[PDB]
Ligand binder design. Structure first.
Ligand SMILES: [C-]#[N+][C@@H]1[C@H]2c3c[nH]c4cccc(c34)C(C)(C)[C@H]2C[C@@H](Cl)[C@]1(C)C=C
Ligand SMILES: CC(C)=CCSP(=O)(O)OP(=O)(O)O
Length: 291
């Protein structure tokens, strides 16, 4: 079956990258969501957030107007009340902005970590009405204006990290210059990467900005780029990129990949790479950003 091949592949990725994982967690996740993994946008992700440690996430998305993952996770025990503003945030999101899709994200050592809300691209003003957003979001209106973060293409609630992301379509001509990325990164006193990475960033069609309830500032920013096959991933930039690009499983032989470049302060400066397991994610990425 597809679901058994997926579960096998996930375990094999975790063992190959030495990622911490829990067989009991994986059993819970697949009990609730394995059927969903078989026939929707499904990806396996690895990242090097923590020092000398690779983490493995699995995630899916589908074009439903309601947030089915929330009901499944509540019923299957994968999401309990946190005693925290995240408890109702996703509900508020789907009440405040109409969704064309939703998604969910799982750390295979923990369980459900995030749920995504995917609207049609809307002005970012539509998010300022969401009551339980961290106050730092409204406090950053002038920042969003200045860096042409006006076109909101997704929202996410990170239940484990207790944080939220806003995702923007990087449509503005200024975002085709390396100076834009140097300036938005320096504005947060984040690390500025090499010129190589900068000329990769200028092609990023999407920018994520992370907020939380523990600071007035931005926690980290992420620039996302897709690659149509293993060969065009910039494997030389980092060993995790090379190893995952050459080894990641998929249902076709040469799958595409989504690469996120994260930047923070002792920070979240790191790489994320996801494999387009079924082949739907990468085209939907280009389509949602009109490329
Ligand atoms: C299918 N789908 C999902 C989609 C998604 C959820 N949140 C997003 C925020 C920005 C962009 C995207 C998403 C897409 C459309 C590029 C997409 C990515 C893949 Cl990796 C995911 C997570 C499924 C495994
Ligand atoms: C397009 C990408 C692959 C999904 C967007 S959500 P994310 O996984 O990048 O969010 P975080 O890394 O948890 O901040």
């Amino acid at each position: 079956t597809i679901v058994n091949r997926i579960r096998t592949d996930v375990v094999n990725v975790a063992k190959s990258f030495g990622a911490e994982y829990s067989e009991a967690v994986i059993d819970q996740i697949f009990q609730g969501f394995g059927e969903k993994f078989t026939n929707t946008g499904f990806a396996i992700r690895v990242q090097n957030k923590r020092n000398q440690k690779v983490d493995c996430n699995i995630r899916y998305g589908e074009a439903k107007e309601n947030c089915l993952a929330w009901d499944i996770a509540r019923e299957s025990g994968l999401l309990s009340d946190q005693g925290h503003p995240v408890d109702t945030l996703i509900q508020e999101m789907f009440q405040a902005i109409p969704a064309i899709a939703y998604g969910a994200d799982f750390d295979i050592n923990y369980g459900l970590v995030k749920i995504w809300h995917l609207p049609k691209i809307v002005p970012v003003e539509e998010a300022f009405k969401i009551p339980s957003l961290p106050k730092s979001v409204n406090a950053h209106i002038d920042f969003f204006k200045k860096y042409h973060l006006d076109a909101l293409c997704a929202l996410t609630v990170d239940y484990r990290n207790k944080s939220t992301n806003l995702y923007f379509d990087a449509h503005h001509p200024e975002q085709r210059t390396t100076q834009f990325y140097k300036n938005i990164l320096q504005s947060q006193q984040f690390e500025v990467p090499s010129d190589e990475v900068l000329e990769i960033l200028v092609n990023c069609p999407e920018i994520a900005v992370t907020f939380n309830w523990s600071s007035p500032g931005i926690e980290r920013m992420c620039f996302y780029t897709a690659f149509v096959n293993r060969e065009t991933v910039p494997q030389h930039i980092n060993p995790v990129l090379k190893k995952f690009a050459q080894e990641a499983p998929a249902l076709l032989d040469n799958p595409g990949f989504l690469v996120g470049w994260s930047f923070g302060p002792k920070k979240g400066t790191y790489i994320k790479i996801d494999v387009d397991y079924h082949g739907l994610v990468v085209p939907s990425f280009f389509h949602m950003h009109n490329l």
